[PDB]
Write an enzyme that holds these catalytic residues in place. Structure first.
Site, PDB file in Angstrom:
ATOM      1  N   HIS A 151     107.252   1.468  -6.034  1.00 49.39           N
ATOM      2  CA  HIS A 151     106.652   2.540  -6.514  1.00 49.39           C
ATOM      3  C   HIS A 151     107.580   2.661  -7.505  1.00 49.39           C
ATOM      4  O   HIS A 151     107.939   2.282  -8.174  1.00 49.39           O
ATOM      5  CB  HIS A 151     107.509   3.415  -5.836  1.00 49.39           C
ATOM      6  CG  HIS A 151     107.650   5.142  -5.094  1.00 49.39           C
ATOM      7  ND1 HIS A 151     108.248   6.055  -5.727  1.00 49.39           N
ATOM      8  CD2 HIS A 151     106.020   5.447  -4.338  1.00 49.39           C
ATOM      9  CE1 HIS A 151     107.740   6.824  -5.562  1.00 49.39           C
ATOM     10  NE2 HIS A 151     106.802   7.210  -4.803  1.00 49.39           N
ATOM     11  N   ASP A 208     101.364  10.990  -1.222  1.00 50.88           N
ATOM     12  CA  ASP A 208     102.399  11.482  -1.860  1.00 50.88           C
ATOM     13  C   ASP A 208     103.064  12.668  -1.047  1.00 50.88           C
ATOM     14  O   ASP A 208     104.008  13.177  -1.672  1.00 50.88           O
ATOM     15  CB  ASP A 208     102.948  11.495  -3.499  1.00 50.88           C
ATOM     16  CG  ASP A 208     103.499  10.131  -3.983  1.00 50.88           C
ATOM     17  OD1 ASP A 208     104.257  10.603  -3.915  1.00 50.88           O
ATOM     18  OD2 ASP A 208     102.640  10.405  -5.514  1.00 50.88           O
TER      19      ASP A 208
HETATM   20  C1  LIG Z   1     111.185  10.695  -5.349  1.00 42.33           C
HETATM   21  O1  LIG Z   1     110.277  10.742  -5.619  1.00 42.33           O
HETATM   22  C2  LIG Z   1     108.708  11.521  -6.138  1.00 42.33           C
HETATM   23  C3  LIG Z   1     109.302  12.528  -6.672  1.00 42.33           C
HETATM   24  C4  LIG Z   1     108.347  13.226  -6.711  1.00 42.33           C
HETATM   25  C5  LIG Z   1     108.072  14.831  -7.964  1.00 42.33           C
HETATM   26  O2  LIG Z   1     110.180  15.031  -8.169  1.00 42.33           O
HETATM   27  O3  LIG Z   1     108.116  15.742  -8.307  1.00 42.33           O
HETATM   28  C6  LIG Z   1     107.184  13.049  -6.795  1.00 42.33           C
HETATM   29  C7  LIG Z   1     106.570  11.815  -5.902  1.00 42.33           C
HETATM   30  C8  LIG Z   1     107.839  10.944  -5.865  1.00 42.33           C
HETATM   31  O4  LIG Z   1     107.485   9.950  -5.333  1.00 42.33           O
HETATM   32 MN   LIG Z   2     105.539   8.606  -4.444  1.00 41.58          MN
END
Ligand SMILES: COc1cc(C(=O)[O-])ccc1O
Ligand SMILES: [Mn+2]
Ligand SMILES: COc1cc(C(=O)[O-])ccc1O
Ligand SMILES: COc1cc(C(=O)[O-])ccc1O
Ligand SMILES: COc1cc(C(=O)[O-])ccc1O
Ligand SMILES: COc1cc(C(=O)[O-])ccc1O
Ligand SMILES: [Mn+2]
Ligand SMILES: [Mn+2]
Lengths: 335, 335
Positions: free
Chosen positions: A174, A297
């Protein structure tokens, strides 16, 4: 009807939340501190996020039901336990993995789980990977791009990849924010995050892994990349074309396969955050339909549009079934 | 009868060669020093390259003739004049532009040309850009990603873009090696170069330009990106999706259009180094057939495979004519 298994669905647990709250007050210069303050800090700019990440049985399940989503494959949200010192990371990884197992077991028809680890201590991480696979019987692994501003070509992490390969568990790499090696160019316009830096950080990690020959050393590794493969599928021809120059003039090691051949053999991708029929079609064409999985997501993105994206994809029903859930059920050993 | 106009065709001139030979001996820490030593250094690893870059009417024209290539759009090869001090860069750009115009005028049915400039001195560059457009009557402009480890969102370069916009010339932003902001991650496996670093450096520059609002300030700019748009076409949906977060939490300025709308309005792309029918089809679908041009990247890549790639593309003949040369003739003022 269509079985939908979403593969990049973030969750958190109170011990990690508490640790990040404390971490948010430190002088850590990691670019992830932007996210960490926004979500876990005092007076957070994104105050609802902890609750939404923590929730599994309320809003999350309600939204799954409203949209006809069969399952979430849950993962401890970035930056996982990777920002902590080795002792703290190792301790919290065990705690988080136990809590993941318990979360899955409360609703195993609706949730599957990826365990995580603290590669700050590769030997201990290797032990935890084994525990996740055999003692907790979780579905796979997740890690958030770099650790300690090193990428996974570094031999420091060989014990981690040895254990992953031996376990048979796929590793979802990720994103997290650009490492210190590259973060200077990502301090503006929100580029630290999903809009740009996440993709650059994660794809560069994976390209280093491939070019370093990691997949000749550990040829049975299975890696999963979200965000339509962090665009690596788009670059396959150029990665192959330029490889000769890299080995001839650039000190790159000789590889058994071409770069794109490692990508097709050892990687699969998900559609998280890339709800584009054109990009989905491209990826199926160049990777094969077995190598593309659907994801939402959540909770960083809403479920309905992600669901409607795959339900309306201009692909045959059998390929759609593979992307929506069949490939995930195979790769992440879900019945 | 298909008119083929190759749009990313590198050339050099003796005054620039001589200056780069001298530069190759200095303690410059720029990641471009790898290329510069390999090609222009006292003990070159790539000793044939200066000759092949310098040649226009010998091997290059013979290869054009044997492959049925109508034209090369020539550009001074990266890193152009951007590594030199301001006065040196300014003088050499002027000289290289005169030599480019004279080269073009010697065989104007076979060669078109892009002028360059030294953004180290924006006010002097602005004068030269006007001269390129109105006196030399060259076909467009070329610059090689960063200058002085700054990207083109920086207001320091506003006078350059003001002059480019007013001139009506399209600017090809060709790669160079990752700037000092990001180069730490590109020191291994030949990643400084075309295999990975070039695309990350150039795409990041362009994304900063878009997100900074440069195209609201100069809405008539035309920018061209090689290597299938440095993969920006693949990222359009995510750039648009995440823009709300960037402006809400990340200090990104409010923009009149969506990121992908700037990309389609203000940019066009070429196929240099990406001889993939699948990637070509994807790009035509998301950008429109008017926004994709063919290129070879000669002498860094051979002509025959690039030619055969477009001659055999699974697209209608009219769209193929647009990609092969029609779009270039429009964008780069070729009769
Ligand atoms: C901390 O992991 C994420 C953050 C965000 C964001 O900040 O929009 C998007 C997808 C993610 O998986
Ligand atoms: Mn993510
Ligand atoms: C024919 O060889 C390749 C083709 C492609 C493609 O077009 O997707 C990518 C990598 C390669 O090495
Ligand atoms: C300096 O410009 C380039 C260099 C290379 C390379 O080193 O293979 C390829 C394409 C380029 O246009
Ligand atoms: C003698 O100094 C310069 C000459 C030129 C030229 O010849 O166009 C351009 C910039 C200079 O700083
Ligand atoms: C519907 O909105 C979008 C669609 C796409 C696409 O699918 O290529 C890209 C950016 C966008 O904002
Ligand atoms: Mn002209
Ligand atoms: Mn080039």
């Amino acid at each position: 009807s269509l079985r939908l298994i979403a593969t990049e669905e973030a969750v958190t647990f109170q011990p990690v939340v508490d640790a990040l709250r404390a971490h948010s007050r430190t002088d850590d210069a990691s670019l992830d501190m932007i996210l960490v303050r926004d979500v876990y800090g005092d007076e957070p700019a994104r105050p609802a996020m902890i609750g939404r990440l923590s929730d599994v049985t309320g809003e999350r399940l309600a939204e799954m039901d409203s949209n006809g989503v069969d399952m979430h494959l849950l993962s401890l949200t970035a930056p996982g336990v990777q920002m902590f010192d080795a002792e703290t990371g190792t301790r919290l990884a065990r705690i988080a993995n136990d809590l993941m197992a318990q979360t899955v077991a409360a609703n195993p028809t609706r949730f599957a789980g990826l365990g995580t680890f603290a590669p700050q201590d590769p030997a201990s991480a290797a032990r935890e990977i084994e525990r996740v696979a055999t003692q907790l019987r979780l579905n796979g692994l997740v890690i958030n791009s770099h650790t300690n501003d090193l990428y996974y070509d570094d031999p420091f992490f060989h014990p981690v990849f040895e254990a992953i390969e031996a376990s048979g568990l796929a590793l979802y790499i990720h994103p997290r924010a650009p490492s210190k090696q590259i973060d200077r160019a990502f301090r503006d316009y929100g580029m630290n995050s999903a809009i740009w830096g996440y993709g650059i950080e994660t794809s560069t990690n994976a390209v280093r892994m491939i070019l370093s020959g990691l997949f000749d050393r550990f040829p049975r590794l299975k890696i999963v990349l979200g965000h339509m493969g962090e665009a690596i599928p788009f670059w396959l021809w150029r990665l192959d074309y330029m490889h000769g120059n890299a080995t001839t003039f650039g000190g790159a090691p000789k590889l058994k396969l071409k770069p794109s051949e490692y990508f097709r053999r050892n990687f699969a991708i998900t559609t998280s955050g890339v709800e584009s029929h054109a990009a989905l079609r491209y990826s199926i064409e160049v990777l094969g339909p077995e190598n593309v999985m659907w994801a939402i997501d959540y909770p960083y993105q809403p479920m309905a549009p992600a669901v409607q994206f795959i339900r309306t994809a201009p692909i045959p029903e059998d390929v759609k079934a593979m992307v929506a859930g069949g490939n995930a059920a195979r790769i992440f050993r879900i019945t």
